[PDB]
Symmetry: D2
Subunit: 379 residues, 4 copies
């Protein structure tokens, strides 16, 4: 029995605003040219958005217009809100190419896949809640359920656990944090009310909820003026909220703004896929698959499956099962997971994993050919 | 028995070049004004360095000159090398200002501490080697031991392991990767020779070395023109090479460019400290400590110590020990670890942890009060 | 008898906004270090101000804060107005240094001095009115005499003339133009009313005024959302409104953002001085002096005084008188005209010439030694 | 009898490099879409080019690639030269838009036309030589006639005059200046030798040449490098070299980067046309025509023809003859002068006037319906 903490941030967060914008460009490209190559990043500050990077593509794209559209969508239409899509400046330092006239990996790296049967989404509950908490603030903001709300927001769900010999059963949410931006025309008392009633309660399960849970509502006091004004923001800086909330591991690879040819993304996705499959097939309760690649080398340089002593068969075997049933060549990962599609913008917020959108072909498990010795496997 | 892989990159790597530059500014500030507040980031691309962020300080600083000095130091003096400190452009978008130990943590977040007695440095061997491999390429480049060498370089050490009931004993280096930039006046064959003879051999222990060890020397073929030219680079994008090579966990917090008031750094450091202490004291073989904080709240919001079943004491008994002996208030963490001191530039390369520089006050363990009930623990 | 046209623009005009900002930096520098060297320029667009250039100085300056202060002063405090000093972005790409009489002209060039006794200010009436017209719109805006007014504005005064054997006597204002920005709460009819009554009438002399005089009040229709938003603006792009409204000549030298060591400014100023003196001493009715310099050469490379046949003395004599009484060495020009002073910001709007501010040491004539053969000349 | 000075600069000059780049974009646009609207500017500093402005067009353009191509063409291969087209950074802040005779002038303004029969090109000899001097340095650089030469260069031709009855007859070149950039592998003595032998002598007529003529060859001493590195450069800053070398007048309107719908260009061109015609028809020896426009008003709001007493009738007639034979509506000017064509890049250097390129439809005069009473005029 122990406690754990995870966090998440809203799409109004400058760091995440970048992630979004970057993947907006990518989508824009794949839309016209699926074979596009996009390795681009966004940086934003006081009154500015600077898009910088490289893109090989045939697609005729209007970058500044895409950018602005994303900022608008996020809700930044007023300078008093801290950002204005209509009046802000957009510097493009992207070097575009025409390219006009299987697949060794494009870069070397390390990538991680994680999965836990503690939740339906095969994700750490601690992370799920944290992010759901945030998606709800969006709903509230957009739908008018809480009109005083503003885009730049942040959350944190630390919760209690227990481990039944490797199986994680969560008990209760020990403490809770949420720091949102807001209009000046709202009472501190009025905020707490709305936050508890219309977000916390409506997202946190009653089973885990208590009279006994701690509450931290804008403990920094007030938060009217925010957004990218004052703070600086960059692509791929929220790498952990993008993934597993620090539960598994990370390879260091920022996902957003990178096309699927980048092993950093593909490998990370395929890794999730494997893991999600491995726990589905009842081979284990908890897994952490690690993949690794060499620049210019098509096949994976190394492979590791770390089940937390939970997995019934054993790791020498698992590592094999994976290899037999999965083609981990970047080129094929793209094909199998349909990563040439324009689905990546929506990936940029509320986490890349745990979401069962149809286009997220890595969240639907595979069916794995198993040696007959382990035909008795699990629930 | 199993395999694992970790990676590292050189200070010539654009992503890391930023990390360095950012921390160069920080140092520059703390030099004159220790009470300085710096939340600043760097971005670079083809011919350009863009410094953006915010910093409250009394220090009179020459940012462009600092920047250039860092680029020069790294070795980028020629456009043919891919970057020129003398000729490149420097855009400053930093907003400069003029401007107790119970201070509330100036942000919310999650932070991780890791330690393993598998090595003298209390670090994952896989990571140690990977980074040592890189530091040696520097030595060679700078000292002229391999003059054809160039700054932009990358490494990857995947190695074989065994676990003796929680204790990690490494067996052999299964495979090795190293992709360096170089002058066009080199023979592909000549590179492999020098790489094996003057780096690999002189860093990798003979005990772990063998004839069946795999070697990947610039498998991307050639690599003459590189650096920030072609690639884009940002601060805090190499968060994993900066820490534990994906062995433990991460909170998502980019270290570089942030002053020590930022919990993302302090908490991460203090966490390492705890861990390093916890296995000094023979309480365990392997630990991962997780800290967590709330914005505006001085005390840590939550705490967790995950020893990998290697801990003699049993789990909750020591979460206590930590609390008793450590003051995890950000304000104190600065004082105790002497984080007001301009030591942060050198932190920006070759990893923040595992290095026993005197100024790294978090690498020298603490001495902890222990209930006498625990007289039997570890060597 | 003939007609002529000249124009002017307000300090809200982006092109002029730059000129101002640039000279704001200069002033800021000379304030601390009179021996400062400043060759810097400003560019502005939609949400952005980019300062680029070079400055050798000991002065410790806060450029972004200076910039913002200038924009504020001009009245751009709202995004709806087209610009916001509070929310806009400021990119500094200027390279600052620490500084390590008969002295070399710092650059080669060609410069012009002009003067006409047609007016008290020794300036073309056509230009005087045009600019006065604009200064009045400022007065009205600032003083609240016309609160609906907005900063970005423009004017144009085309005037009828007659020449009495070289002497220009103006007859009447043939046509008039004025295009101002404004709040959207104002009626088209209400604008024309206020413009005629509170500016035109209060600036244009009744002697020159008529019932037949043409009037062009925002003929582009509406003009609510203007400023640097939409329109690109640069330093030294309004070189003619800065000087003589196209009456004399120009050397091409942008004045603003350049310190007084730059012959482009000094020579131009000294030239005005000479001219103003030459017509004061009753040597002529109308003069256009041209100066010319060589890079690294202290003395003027060439000299020319073109009186429009209005000069009693004959030209060969004049250019002598000039030489005898004036020290046209850049080094001296600075000393004599007190150009080490922070007076240059206010020079950046409403024209560099014709204004009898005490600090404008080039508007107060000299007393010249004249051959006794021609004590009979003009009033 | 008197002296006069004019100047010019090479296409390597940063200020002029911008002018070129800007008009390169324009051409690029008109190429696909003649009805394009382009109001864009370039700014350059160290290893950086910033393109900013607005363009309404259907044309699909690759701005960074065009830019780079222009810089290359100009000769900046080596960061060693002060600029490198291959390695420099390109920031695009241009706001691009799809597109939704007798139209109103787009903007208000003042414009000038000048012509002098002192030379074949109907231009001031002082300016012609100055610029020819520079074109020759190009020839030499490009053709290898002087391989040590480098692109950033500057010239200045001050020459002696006489006017006989309003007719300017030039006598001799009093002094000469030329400051060129160069390779470090060449001597100061060797430089002087070349410029005198292979430029000065091969451009300056021997009739105007002599032994007493002054020579200023890199008086700033050395000039190994240069370019945009260490100088700042902007579009439309060399407005005088672009036109008449300060002989006539200027309206303040920067030509380059503006499409022909901009009266600043059209009016200036049409003005030259008129003047060139007026002196061709033997109506006078020397003319300066001034045009003037109102925003949104199609017809010219004012008109003036200043012949320097060198015209053969009153000046009210001339003003008539102009009106009768020319349609000065911006809309028509475009049609008659074929200003929808991509000819504007080459205009950006060596002056907009005096060059008898076929595409320069404003340099070939018109035939004017003059009265029968004035059938006796001029040679």
């Amino acid at each position: 029995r122990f406690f754990f903490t995870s966090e998440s941030v809203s799409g109004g967060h400058p760091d995440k605003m970048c992630d979004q914008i970057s993947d907006a460009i990518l989508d824009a490209c794949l839309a016209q040219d699926p074979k596009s190559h996009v390795a681009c990043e966004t940086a934003t500050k006081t009154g500015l958005i600077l898009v910088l990077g490289e893109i090989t593509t045939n697609a005729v794209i209007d970058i500044p217009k895409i950018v602005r559209g994303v900022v608008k969508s996020i809700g930044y239409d007023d300078t008093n809100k801290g950002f204005d899509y209509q009046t802000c400046s957009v510097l493009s330092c992207v070097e575009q190419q025409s390219q006009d006239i299987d697949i060794g990996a494009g870069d070397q790296g390390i990538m991680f896949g994680y999965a836990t049967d503690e939740s339906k989404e095969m994700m750490p509950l601690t992370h799920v809640l944290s992010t759901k908490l945030i998606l709800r603030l969006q709903e509230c903001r957009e739908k008018g359920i809480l009109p005083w709300l503003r885009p730049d927001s942040k959350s944190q769900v630390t919760l209690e656990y227990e481990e039944v010999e490797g199986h994680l059963k969560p008990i209760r949410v020990h403490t809770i944090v949420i720091s949102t931006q807001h209009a000046d025309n709202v009472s501190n008392e009025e905020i707490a009310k709305g936050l508890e009633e219309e977000v916390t309660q409506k997202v946190i399960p009653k089973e885990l909820m208590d009279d006994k849970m701690l509450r931290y509502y804008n403990p920094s006091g007030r938060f009217v003026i925010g957004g990218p004004m004052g703070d600086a923001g960059l692509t791929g800086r929220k790498i952990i909220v993008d993934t597993y909330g620090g539960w598994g591991a990370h390879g260091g690879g920022a996902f957003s703004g990178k096309d699927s040819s980048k092993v950093d993304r593909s490998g990370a996705y395929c890794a999730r896929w494997i893991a999600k499959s491995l726990v589905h097939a009842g081979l284990c309760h908890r897994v952490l698959v690690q993949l690794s690649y060499a620049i210019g080398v098509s096949h994976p340089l190394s492979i590791n499956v770390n089940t937390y002593g939970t997995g019934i068969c054993d790791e020498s075997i698992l590592v094999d099962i994976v290899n037999k049933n999965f083609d981990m060549r970047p080129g094929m990962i793209i094909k199998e997971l349909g990563l040439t599609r324009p689905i990546f913008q929506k990936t940029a917020v509320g986490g890349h994993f745990g979401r069962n959108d149809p286009d997220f072909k890595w969240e639907f498990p595979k069916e794995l050919e198993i040696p007959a010795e382990l035909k008795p496997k699990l629930l």
